[PDB]
Design a protein around this ligand. Structure first.
Ligand SMILES: [Mg+2]
Ligand SMILES: [Mg+2]
Lengths: 45, 133, 237, 60, 173
RNA sequence: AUCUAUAAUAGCUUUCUC
RNA sequence: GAGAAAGCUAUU
């Protein structure tokens, strides 16, 4: 399906990645350390 | 399977008058309008990136659930699965010349069914709906 | 008009409000009331969210002055309003689908991990319970929606999630903001409903107008005369 | 057409092609046609439908 | 036999055959009569009531729900930035980048109507800054000529841009 | 009774100046 | 250097 939205691709990807990291940390798919690294990189953007 | 478990009758030579009608190309499990089918496929394969829960899509909810439970650990690429589901759920209706057998099970064999001057009796396999009978 | 909002609200908050209005397809200049409402809604959502935080044992604690960014890494209340429609829908469906919760038919405003529920934060003026039940009419309990009001009245849902400190903070901030706007006399600028029916804007510049004028058939001066002839002449016979 | 032919009459078919179809059709006529067709539309849509024949009437 | 004049927008010589003299022989004729066209259209409207209104309403609603990426659904398209032919998506992207360079942002709304508004507003711009392509040429011993393309910032005036935007590129079938 | 609805890419045919 | 539109087909 063709994506829709007037916002930047970078912000869309950033929010999707942030949600995915949050959800797979809350489900026990990633540890504390890599989640800290992922959130640090997401905040660095 | 429908082709193999099929019986062929005799062939008759004589005038055949074919009318051009919009007919269903291939038999379908659950014929749905392409928008509803697209939403259902989106629910089955990409539930997270789906959007507003349209009411009509809830009508097929049970069906949706079934497909999801059949695709929990499938490593096939999602887009190929999406077009598999679309082929299973979206009707393709085309204008074709027909003569006396317009059910999709006969439309898939239309080329062997008849010409302008001959007819071939064909008994397809599978099970037929009561509406057609 | 915009001066009060720029001086009181932050640049990011007003930018989010403008983006939301642009997505909603309404002119930003002729309706400051919607702009102010969106600004205050998302601002109070941020104020609520900046109160609670998550530990490693699934409890909701409070932070205060003198805390680093390692202790502040993940939030308690996930704020959905102010995000674009596509991003907001993705977030809501993701939370619902990975928390085993049926997704509601309407976009939410917040999500709480402690109770794992969606919240529709709203602000009104009249009776708090009246608006509470009016919102309750559509789905009933699909969202533990919360109703606030400017007269220090509120109809909190059964799922109690805020303590006295944060609620008092929000109420005092709302009272201060209302007083600050009232001394500037902006209330009559916003309460008065001025909504004329608006369509699609497509205006022709000078070059295209000149091209259209010289593009008319022979026998007309400009396009206005040709259009009038087309509309008001019977070509019969 | 066959059924509606008057009784006792005759019917003719002309197989026809138009010569110089593209070189003779004028975009100003198309501008007039779009103005007549979108007679009961809002102003903005009428201008939008008028843009294309105008651009074709000044083509290079 | 029509009316010949000089365009005050581009300076080209324009010919207007509409409402010209009626033909006197069987040679091809471009002199359509406006009143006759209007009468034919009125007869069509009388034979099919509400047809024009229904068609206009459907077209307007489709235009409202039409996005910019529809323009990517074409074959080789004339690109005015490079004055060449490029695939439709590439030409559209170069146009959008150029309009961004010229402080036009109607494509960011995503609909066709704001993009068309930005197009007809670009027609009013006194200057146009865009990205064009330059081919560096090398004398390769072997001698042959080697071409290496690179994008550069180019600028054109109002009339030059208007003539480029109204230009059709012709080739052979 | 198929009437609604119908993402993109590519191909083929037809029509579009002598 | 190989356009527009329509129909049809294949594919993802
Ligand atoms: Mg012919
Ligand atoms: Mg011809």
């Amino acid at each position: 399906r063709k994506p829709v939205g007037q916002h930047s691709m970078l912000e869309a990807m950033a929010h999707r990645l942030r949600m995915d990291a949050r959800l797979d940390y809350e489900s026990g798919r990633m540890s504390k350390d890599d989640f800290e690294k992922a959130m640090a990189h997401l905040g660095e953007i | 399977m429908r082709l193999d478990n099929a019986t062929w009758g005799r062939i008759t030579f004589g005038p055949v008058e074919r009318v051009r009608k919009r007919v269903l190309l291939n038999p379908l499990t659950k014929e749905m309008p392409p928008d509803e089918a697209s939403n259902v496929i989106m629910e089955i394969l990409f539930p997270k990136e789906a959007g507003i829960p349209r009411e009509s899509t809830w009508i097929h909810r049970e069906l949706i659930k079934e497909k999801r439970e059949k695709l929990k650990g499938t490593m096939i690429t999602p887009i190929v699965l999406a077009y598999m589901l679309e082929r299973e759920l979206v009707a393709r209706r085309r204008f074709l010349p027909v003569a006396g057998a317009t059910s999709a099970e006969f439309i898939e064999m239309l080329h062997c069914l008849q010409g302008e001057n001959w007819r071939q009796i064909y008994h397809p396999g599978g099970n037929k709906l009561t509406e057609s009978r | 008009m915009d001066t009060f909002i720029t001086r009181n609200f932050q640049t990011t908050i007003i930018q989010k409000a403008k983006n939301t209005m642009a997505e909603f397809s309404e002119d930003p200049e002729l309706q400051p009331a919607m702009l102010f409402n969106i600004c205050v809604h998302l601002e109070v959502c941020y104020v609520i969210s900046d109160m609670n935080f998550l530990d490693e044992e699934g409890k909701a604690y409070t932070a205060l002055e003198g805390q680093g960014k390692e202790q502040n890494l993940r939030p308690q209340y996930e704020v959905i309003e102010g995000m674009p429609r596509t991003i907001a829908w993705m977030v809501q469906r993701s939370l619902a689908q990975e928390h085993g919760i049926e997704t509601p038919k309407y976009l939410a405003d917040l999500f709480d991990y402690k109770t794992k529920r969606f919240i529709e934060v709203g602000i009104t003026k009249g009776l708090a319970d009246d608006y509470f039940w009016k919102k309750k009419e559509k789905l009933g309990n699909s969202m533990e929606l919360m109703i606030f009001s400017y007269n220090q009245d509120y109809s909190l849902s059964n799922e109690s999630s805020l303590d006295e400190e944060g609620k008092g903070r929000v109420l005092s901030r709302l009272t201060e903001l209302q007083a600050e706007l009232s001394l500037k006399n902006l209330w009559q600028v916003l309460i008065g409903e001025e909504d004329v029916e608006k369509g699609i804007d497509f205006k022709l510049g000078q070059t295209i107008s000149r091209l259209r004028d010289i593009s008319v058939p022979a026998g007309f001066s400009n396009f206005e005369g040709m259009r009038s002839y087309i509309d008001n002449i019977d070509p019969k016979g | 057409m066959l059924s509606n032919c008057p009784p006792g009459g005759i019917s003719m078919t002309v197989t026809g092609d138009n010569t110089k179809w593209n070189e003779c059709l004028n975009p100003r006529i198309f501008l007039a046609m779009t103005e007549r067709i979108t007679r009961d539309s809002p102003i903005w849509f009428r201008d939008f439908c008028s843009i294309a024949p105008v651009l074709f009437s000044n083509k290079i | 036999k029509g009316k010949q004049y000089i365009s005050d927008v581009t300076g080209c010589t324009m010919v207007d055959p509409t409402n010209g003299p009626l033909p006197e022989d069987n040679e091809p004729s471009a002199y359509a009569q406006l009143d006759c066209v209007l009468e034919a259209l009125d007869r069509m409207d009388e034979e099919h009531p509400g047809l024009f209104q229904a068609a206009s309403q459907n077209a307007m609603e489709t235009l409202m729900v039409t996005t910019v990426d529809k323009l990517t659904q074409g074959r080789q398209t004339f690109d005015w930035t490079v004055c060449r032919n490029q695939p439709a998506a590439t030409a559209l992207n170069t146009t959008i980048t150029s309009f961004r360079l010229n402080d036009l942002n109607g494509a960011d709304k995503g609909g066709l109507i704001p993009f068309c508004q930005d197009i007809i507003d670009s027609l009013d711009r006194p200057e146009m800054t865009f990205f064009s392509v330059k081919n560096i040429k090398k004398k390769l011993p072997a001698f042959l000529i080697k071409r290496i393309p690179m994008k550069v910032k180019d600028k054109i005036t109002k009339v030059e841009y208007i003539k480029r935007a109204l230009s059709l590129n012709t080739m052979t079938k």
